[PDB]
Coordinates of N, CA, C and O in Angstrom, one line a residue:
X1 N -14.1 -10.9 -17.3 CA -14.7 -9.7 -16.5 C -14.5 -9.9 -15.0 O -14.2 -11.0 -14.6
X2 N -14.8 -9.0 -14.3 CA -15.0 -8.9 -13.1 C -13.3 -9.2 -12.2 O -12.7 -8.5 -11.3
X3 N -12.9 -10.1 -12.6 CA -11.3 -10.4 -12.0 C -10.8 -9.3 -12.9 O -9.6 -9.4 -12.4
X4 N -10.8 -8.4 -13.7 CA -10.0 -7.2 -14.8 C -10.4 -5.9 -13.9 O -9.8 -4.9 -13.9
X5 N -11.2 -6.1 -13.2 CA -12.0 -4.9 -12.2 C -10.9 -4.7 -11.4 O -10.0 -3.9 -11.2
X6 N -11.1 -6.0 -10.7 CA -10.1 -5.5 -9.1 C -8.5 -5.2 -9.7 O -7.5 -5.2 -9.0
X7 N -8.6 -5.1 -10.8 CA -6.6 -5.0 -11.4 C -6.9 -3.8 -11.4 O -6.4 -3.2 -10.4
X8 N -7.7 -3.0 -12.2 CA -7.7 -1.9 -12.4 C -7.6 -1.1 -11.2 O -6.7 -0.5 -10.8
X9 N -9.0 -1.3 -10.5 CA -8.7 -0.5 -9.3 C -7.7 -0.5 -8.3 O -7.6 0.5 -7.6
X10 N -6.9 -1.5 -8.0 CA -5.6 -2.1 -7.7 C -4.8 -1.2 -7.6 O -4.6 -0.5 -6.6
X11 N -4.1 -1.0 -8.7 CA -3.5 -0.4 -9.5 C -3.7 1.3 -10.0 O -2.8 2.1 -10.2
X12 N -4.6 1.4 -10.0 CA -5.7 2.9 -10.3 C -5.5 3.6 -8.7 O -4.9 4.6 -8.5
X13 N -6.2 2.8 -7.5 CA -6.1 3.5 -6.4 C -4.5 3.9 -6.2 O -4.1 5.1 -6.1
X14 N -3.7 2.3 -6.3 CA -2.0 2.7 -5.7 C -1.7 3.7 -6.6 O -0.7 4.3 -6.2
X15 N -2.1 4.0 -7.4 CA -1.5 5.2 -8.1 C -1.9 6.8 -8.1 O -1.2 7.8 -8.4
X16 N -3.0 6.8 -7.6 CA -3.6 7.8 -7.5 C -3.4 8.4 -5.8 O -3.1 9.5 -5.4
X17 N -3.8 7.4 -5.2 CA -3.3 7.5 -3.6 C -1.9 8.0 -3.6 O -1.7 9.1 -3.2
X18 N -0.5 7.2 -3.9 CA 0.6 7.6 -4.4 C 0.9 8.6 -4.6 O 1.9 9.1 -4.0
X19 N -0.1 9.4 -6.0 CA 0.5 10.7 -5.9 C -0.3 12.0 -4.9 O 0.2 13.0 -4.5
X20 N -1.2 11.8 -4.9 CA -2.3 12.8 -3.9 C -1.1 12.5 -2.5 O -0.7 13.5 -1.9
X21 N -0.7 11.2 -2.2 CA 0.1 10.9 -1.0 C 1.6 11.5 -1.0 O 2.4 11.8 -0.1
X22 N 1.9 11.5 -2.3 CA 3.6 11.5 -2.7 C 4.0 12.4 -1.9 O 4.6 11.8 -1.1
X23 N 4.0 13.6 -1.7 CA 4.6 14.5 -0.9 C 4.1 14.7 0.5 O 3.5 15.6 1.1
X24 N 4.4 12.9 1.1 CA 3.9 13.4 2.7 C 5.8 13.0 3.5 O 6.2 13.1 4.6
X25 N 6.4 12.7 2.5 CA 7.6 12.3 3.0 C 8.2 13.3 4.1 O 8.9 13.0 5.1
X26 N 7.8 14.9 3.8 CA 8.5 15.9 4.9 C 7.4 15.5 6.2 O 7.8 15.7 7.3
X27 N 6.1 14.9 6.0 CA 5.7 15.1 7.5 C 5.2 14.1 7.5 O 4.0 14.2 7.9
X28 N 5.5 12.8 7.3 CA 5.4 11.4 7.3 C 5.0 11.1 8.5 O 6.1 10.9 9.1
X29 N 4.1 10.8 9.2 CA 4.0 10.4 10.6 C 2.8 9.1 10.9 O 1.6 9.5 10.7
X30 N 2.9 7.8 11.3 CA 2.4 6.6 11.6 C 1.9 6.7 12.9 O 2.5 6.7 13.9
X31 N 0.5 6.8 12.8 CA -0.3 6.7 14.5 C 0.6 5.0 14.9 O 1.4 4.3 14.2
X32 N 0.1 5.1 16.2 CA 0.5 3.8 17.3 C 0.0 2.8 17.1 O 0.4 1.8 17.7
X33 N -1.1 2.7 16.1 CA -1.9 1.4 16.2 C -1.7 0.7 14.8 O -2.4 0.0 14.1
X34 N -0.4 1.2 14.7 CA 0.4 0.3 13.6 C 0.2 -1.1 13.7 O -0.2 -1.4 14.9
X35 N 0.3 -2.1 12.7 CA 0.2 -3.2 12.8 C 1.3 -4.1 11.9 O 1.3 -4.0 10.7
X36 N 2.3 -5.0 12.6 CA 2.9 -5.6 12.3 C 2.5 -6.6 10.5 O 3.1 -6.6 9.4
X37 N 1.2 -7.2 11.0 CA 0.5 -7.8 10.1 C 0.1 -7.1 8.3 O 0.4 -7.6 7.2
X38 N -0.5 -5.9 8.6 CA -1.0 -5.1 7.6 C 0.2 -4.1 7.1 O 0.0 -3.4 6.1
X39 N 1.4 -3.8 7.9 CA 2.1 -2.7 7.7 C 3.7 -3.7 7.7 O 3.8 -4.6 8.6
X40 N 4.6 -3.5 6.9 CA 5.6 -3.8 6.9 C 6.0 -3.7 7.8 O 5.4 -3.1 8.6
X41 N 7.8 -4.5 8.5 CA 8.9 -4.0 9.8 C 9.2 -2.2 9.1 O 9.2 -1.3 9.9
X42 N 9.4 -2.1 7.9 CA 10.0 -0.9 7.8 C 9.0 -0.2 7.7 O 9.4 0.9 8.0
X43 N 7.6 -0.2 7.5 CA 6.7 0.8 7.6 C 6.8 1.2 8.7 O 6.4 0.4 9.6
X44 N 7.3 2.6 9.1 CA 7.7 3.2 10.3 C 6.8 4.7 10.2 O 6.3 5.1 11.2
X45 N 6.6 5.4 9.0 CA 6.2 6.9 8.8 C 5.3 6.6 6.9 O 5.5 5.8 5.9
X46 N 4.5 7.4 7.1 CA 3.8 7.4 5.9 C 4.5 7.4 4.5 O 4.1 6.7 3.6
X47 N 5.9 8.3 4.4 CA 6.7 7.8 3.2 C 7.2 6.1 3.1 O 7.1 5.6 2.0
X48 N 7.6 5.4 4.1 CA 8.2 4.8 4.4 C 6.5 3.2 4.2 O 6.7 2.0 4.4
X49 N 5.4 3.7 3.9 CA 4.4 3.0 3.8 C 4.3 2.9 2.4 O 4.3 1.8 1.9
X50 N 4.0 4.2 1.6 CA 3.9 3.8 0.5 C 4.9 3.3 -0.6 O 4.6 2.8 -1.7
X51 N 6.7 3.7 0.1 CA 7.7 3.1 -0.6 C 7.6 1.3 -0.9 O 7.7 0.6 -2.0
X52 N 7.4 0.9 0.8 CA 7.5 -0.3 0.9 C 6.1 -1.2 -0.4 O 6.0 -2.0 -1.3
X53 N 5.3 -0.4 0.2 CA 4.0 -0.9 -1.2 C 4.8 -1.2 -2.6 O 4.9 -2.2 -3.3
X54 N 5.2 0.1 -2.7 CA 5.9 0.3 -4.3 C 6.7 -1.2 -3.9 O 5.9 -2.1 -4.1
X55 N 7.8 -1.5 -3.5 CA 8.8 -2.3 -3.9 C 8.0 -4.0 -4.0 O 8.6 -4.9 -4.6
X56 N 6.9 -4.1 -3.2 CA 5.7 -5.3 -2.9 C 5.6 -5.1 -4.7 O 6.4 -5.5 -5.5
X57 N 4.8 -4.6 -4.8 CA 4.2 -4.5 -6.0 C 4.5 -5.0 -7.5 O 4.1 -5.8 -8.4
X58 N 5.9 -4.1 -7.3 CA 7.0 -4.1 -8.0 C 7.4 -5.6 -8.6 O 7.3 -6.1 -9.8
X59 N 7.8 -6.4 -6.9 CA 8.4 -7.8 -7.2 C 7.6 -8.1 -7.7 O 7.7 -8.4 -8.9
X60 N 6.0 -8.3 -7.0 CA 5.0 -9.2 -7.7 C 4.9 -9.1 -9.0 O 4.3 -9.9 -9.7
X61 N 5.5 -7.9 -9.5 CA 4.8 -7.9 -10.9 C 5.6 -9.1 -11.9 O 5.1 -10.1 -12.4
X62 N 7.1 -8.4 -11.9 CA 8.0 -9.4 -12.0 C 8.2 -10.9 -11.6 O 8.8 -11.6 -12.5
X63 N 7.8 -11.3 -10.7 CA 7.7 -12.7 -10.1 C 7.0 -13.4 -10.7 O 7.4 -14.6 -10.6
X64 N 5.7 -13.1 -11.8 CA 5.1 -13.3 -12.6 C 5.7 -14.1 -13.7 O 5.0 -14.6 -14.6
X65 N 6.9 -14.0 -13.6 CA 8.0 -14.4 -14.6 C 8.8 -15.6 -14.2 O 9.2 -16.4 -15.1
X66 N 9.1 -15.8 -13.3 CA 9.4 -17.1 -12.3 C 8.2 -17.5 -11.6 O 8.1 -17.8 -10.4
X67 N 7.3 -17.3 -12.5 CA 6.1 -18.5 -11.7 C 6.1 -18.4 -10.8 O 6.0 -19.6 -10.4
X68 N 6.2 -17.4 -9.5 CA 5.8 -17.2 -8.1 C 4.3 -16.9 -7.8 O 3.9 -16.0 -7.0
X69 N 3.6 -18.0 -8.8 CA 2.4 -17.5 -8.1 C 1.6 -17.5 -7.0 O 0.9 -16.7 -6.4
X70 N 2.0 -19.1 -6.5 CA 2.0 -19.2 -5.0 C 2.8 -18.0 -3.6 O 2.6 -18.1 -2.4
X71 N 3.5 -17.2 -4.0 CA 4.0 -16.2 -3.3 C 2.8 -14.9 -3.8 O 2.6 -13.9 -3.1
X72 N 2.4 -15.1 -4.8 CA 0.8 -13.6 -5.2 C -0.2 -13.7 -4.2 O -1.1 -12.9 -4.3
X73 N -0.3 -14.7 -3.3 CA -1.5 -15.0 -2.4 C -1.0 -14.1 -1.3 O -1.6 -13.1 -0.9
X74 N 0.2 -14.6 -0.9 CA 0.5 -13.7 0.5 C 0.9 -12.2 0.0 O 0.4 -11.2 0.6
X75 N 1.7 -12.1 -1.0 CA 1.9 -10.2 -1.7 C 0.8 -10.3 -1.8 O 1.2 -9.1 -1.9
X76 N -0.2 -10.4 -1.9 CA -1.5 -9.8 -2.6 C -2.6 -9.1 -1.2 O -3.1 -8.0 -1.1
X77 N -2.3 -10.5 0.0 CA -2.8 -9.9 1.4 C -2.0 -9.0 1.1 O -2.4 -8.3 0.2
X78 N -1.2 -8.7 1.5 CA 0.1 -7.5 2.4 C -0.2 -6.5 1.5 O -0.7 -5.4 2.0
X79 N -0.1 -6.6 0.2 CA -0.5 -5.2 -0.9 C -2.0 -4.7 -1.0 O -2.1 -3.5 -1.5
X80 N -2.8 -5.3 -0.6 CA -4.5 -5.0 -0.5 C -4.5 -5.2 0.8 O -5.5 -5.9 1.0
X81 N -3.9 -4.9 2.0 CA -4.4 -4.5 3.1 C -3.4 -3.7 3.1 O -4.0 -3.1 4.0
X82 N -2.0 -2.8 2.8 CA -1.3 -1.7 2.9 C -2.3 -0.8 2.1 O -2.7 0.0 3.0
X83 N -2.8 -0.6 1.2 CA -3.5 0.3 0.6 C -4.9 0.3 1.0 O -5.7 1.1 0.4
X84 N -5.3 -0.2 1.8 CA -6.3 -0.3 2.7 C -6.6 0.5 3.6 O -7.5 1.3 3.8
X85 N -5.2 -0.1 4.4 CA -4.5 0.7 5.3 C -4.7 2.0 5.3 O -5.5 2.6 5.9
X86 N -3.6 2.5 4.3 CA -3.4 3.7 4.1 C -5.0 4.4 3.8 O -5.4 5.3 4.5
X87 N -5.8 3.9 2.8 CA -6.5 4.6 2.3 C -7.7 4.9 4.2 O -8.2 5.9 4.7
X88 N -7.7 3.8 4.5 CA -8.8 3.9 5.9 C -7.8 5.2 6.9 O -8.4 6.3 7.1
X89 N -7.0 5.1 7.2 CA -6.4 6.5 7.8 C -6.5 8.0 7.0 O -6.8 9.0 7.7
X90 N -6.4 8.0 6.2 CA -6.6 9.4 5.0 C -7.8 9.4 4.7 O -8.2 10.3 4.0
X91 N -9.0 8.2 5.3 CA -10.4 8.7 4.7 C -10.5 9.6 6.2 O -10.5 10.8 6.3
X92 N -10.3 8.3 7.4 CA -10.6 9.6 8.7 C -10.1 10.6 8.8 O -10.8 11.5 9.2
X93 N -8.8 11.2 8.4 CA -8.3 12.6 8.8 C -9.0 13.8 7.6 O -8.9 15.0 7.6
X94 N -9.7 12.8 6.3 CA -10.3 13.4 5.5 C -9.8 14.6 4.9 O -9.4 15.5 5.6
X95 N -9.8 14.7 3.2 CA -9.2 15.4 2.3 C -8.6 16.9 3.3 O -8.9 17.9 2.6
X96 N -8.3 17.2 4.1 CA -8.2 18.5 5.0 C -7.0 18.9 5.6 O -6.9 20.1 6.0
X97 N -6.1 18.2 5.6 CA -4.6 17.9 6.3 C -4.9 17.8 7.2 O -6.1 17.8 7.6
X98 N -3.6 17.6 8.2 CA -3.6 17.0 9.6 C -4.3 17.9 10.7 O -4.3 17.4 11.9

């Protein structure tokens, strides 16, 4: 218990954010206070944030397979502060558009 929680919602959020988010690729736009740290080099515009998530995700899941579990510590920061991320900007401009 309790470690099955944060998978779900993990997972549950990236997916649900994802698609409520999916079609921002025409007006994809990244305020200034981007962060090297929490946002990818190619996180440049909002499509370009949740793609890169996807491909994070993705490997980790996979890597699971070559025993990279020592690499799930750092994907795990980068993937739970990108959806973080994203979700803390989309709470302030709030369900409303831009």
């Amino acid at each position: 218990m309790k470690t099955a929680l944060l998978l779900e919602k993990l997972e549950g959020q990236l997916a649900t954010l994802r698609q409520r988010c999916a079609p921002v690729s025409q007006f994809a736009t990244l305020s200034a206070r981007f962060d090297r740290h929490l946002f990818q080099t190619r996180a440049t515009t909002l499509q370009a944030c949740l793609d890169e998530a996807g491909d994070n995700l993705a490997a980790l899941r996979h890597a699971v397979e070559q025993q990279q579990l020592p690499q799930v510590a750092w994907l795990a920061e980068h993937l739970a502060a990108q959806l973080e991320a994203i979700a803390r900007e989309a709470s302030a401009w709030s369900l409303r558009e831009w």
